[model samples]
Target chain A: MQFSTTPTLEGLTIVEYCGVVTGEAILGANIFRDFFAGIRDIVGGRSGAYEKELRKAREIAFEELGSQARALGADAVVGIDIDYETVGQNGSMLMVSVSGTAVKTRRNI
Target chain B: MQFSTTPTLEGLTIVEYCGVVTGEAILGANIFRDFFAGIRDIVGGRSGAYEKELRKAREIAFEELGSQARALGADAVVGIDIDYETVGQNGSMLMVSVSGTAVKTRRNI
Candidate 1:
């Protein structure tokens, strides 16, 4: 249930490396947000809509990642990495993803 | 300088955690490598022509990360994380990126 970005767990012994696991999420585009986003783009402002959707997708991906780790019987995940990509199809569909090494760990104590 | 994916070094004591440092690299997209030809050459476990592009980008990103750590006067970098992302318009361009933490450490004298 603990996640460490570090490759090794602290005060814990690893039982197994369950291997790579990943999670992803996608969201549909909002045309209204895009219209305002275009205005912002011209003025050098952020595209809030993308950020907003990205945040939500991150959470969704997190849970999905946890589920994947669980399926691998991993008690923890390590060496985590997260990434974002927006694949344009009609300039829509924001994508978020995450990947990490899963491990079964036991407390050194 | 040494790099350890673990949070702590075994034989060496950390003099300081130089704080988080990051590096990034971008590899441009190639049509044949991106989709078709890239996957065709894979023999078994992994590797394709496209993977070579990713491999180069990762190396560059690692180099940049090393520079950042050296600037921090770090002896090592821990809790390393690497990630990739792509930005494309009509599939004309593609990109890759990575990030990691930097730390200052010394051997136990």
Candidate 2:
């Protein structure tokens, strides 16, 4: 299985379009985590914790993407798009979503 | 003008659908910047540089969103959706995109 933002993958031929599939992953922090993060922000010059967290969130989204693609009987996902934002009532949650056209493909060579 | 992810805004009445509008912003890095970033990654335990960059990119996208909405004669954007992804060759570019339904809206009360 493969993923590409391009409408079509190079070196592969799409034999079927299985329609659009989507995945979403959200990480929340209302109290303790937010408090800890604020403290860390004040004390630390720079922190990659949020980056790490976002990366993890995207990973989870990708996992769901794979599952959805597989369920669609697709061998690849193309024209993929992804979104990220702070959501939830207090905007204390990080949300990542991805969508793509699942396809059945075969190697060109 | 207002922007909301929800289909409708709480205190606004959407009187007309101005159709969908979209915005895209891409940040690119090659050679020196990539080198500097890699070194910074190694020397620095973790950095907020990427997060800052992504935020800036999103701001650019929002600017475009506003421009597009204005062109559509829209007073607000509703049902907003946002996406982020790594694009371009070597995935050295960070892309942010947003889409929403442009609507002519007025105060509900």
Candidate 3:
């Protein structure tokens, strides 16, 4: 019997590498609710807390993407995109993603 | 006396227009300190809340920049840079800035 060798995805270059990861922390319902109530004064707009919460969610999602990039041994990640959604009534979620053809760079031929 | 008729900087196309604005929020000292202490368990890192707070600060700064762009009636703003620092012993601050030559784009010649 012969054994076939399969290389790790991390070592493959011809194939594009991509992954999805999420980060989240629950904001206190009362605090968050009140925060939103006060947002108009701080941001000069209506629905203060909603905006603040959305921003926090995006940042958490970006942090997860950064960690994923590091795991892939990528010097730089390009073509990044972000998405968000509201979970339940008051909860929110954010997702940050990066995708590209992973290739090894060389000097000159 | 003749009025010089010096145009508003916002309307000038030849010269680059730029401005700096700041946004800040105070986090509870004890809560933030405790959050940082708990970060290791959740994110598998040494500090917890520091990163979260930093991210929030950056977002606020970006919001301020967005406001500035709207004030100038700019289609888009580019070349943004960010800075952060700890205030006193228990507080932190972040500043997001954008600088570029504002130009009016025309169709084909």
lDDT of 3 at B103: 25
Question: What does candidate 3's lDDT look like per residue over B6-104, in tens digits?
Answer: 111111223344443333444444544455322221231112345565456445644555565666655334322222223343231212222232222
Candidate 3: residue A74 lDDT (0-100):
43
In model 3, which regions exceed 4 Å deviation? A1-109, B1-31, B38-53, B90-109
Q: Cα deviation in Å at residue A84, candidate 1?
A: 2.0
Segments of candidate 2 deviating more than 4 angstroms: A1-109, B31-47
- RMSD in Å for candidate 3, one decimal? 18.9
Each candidate's chain A: what TM-score? 0.76, 0.82, 0.44
Better of 2 and 3 by TM-score: 2
Clashes of 1: 0
**Tens-digit per-residue lDDT, A9-91, candidate 2:** 66776666665555655555443154334654244324644566566667777777778789979888776777655432333
RMSD of each: 9.1, 17.1, 18.9
- The number of the candidate with the highest TM-score is 1
User: DockQ numbers for every candidate?
Assistant: 0.09, 0.03, 0.02
Steric clash pairs (candidate 1): none
How high is the lDDT of residue B39 in model 1?
A: 51
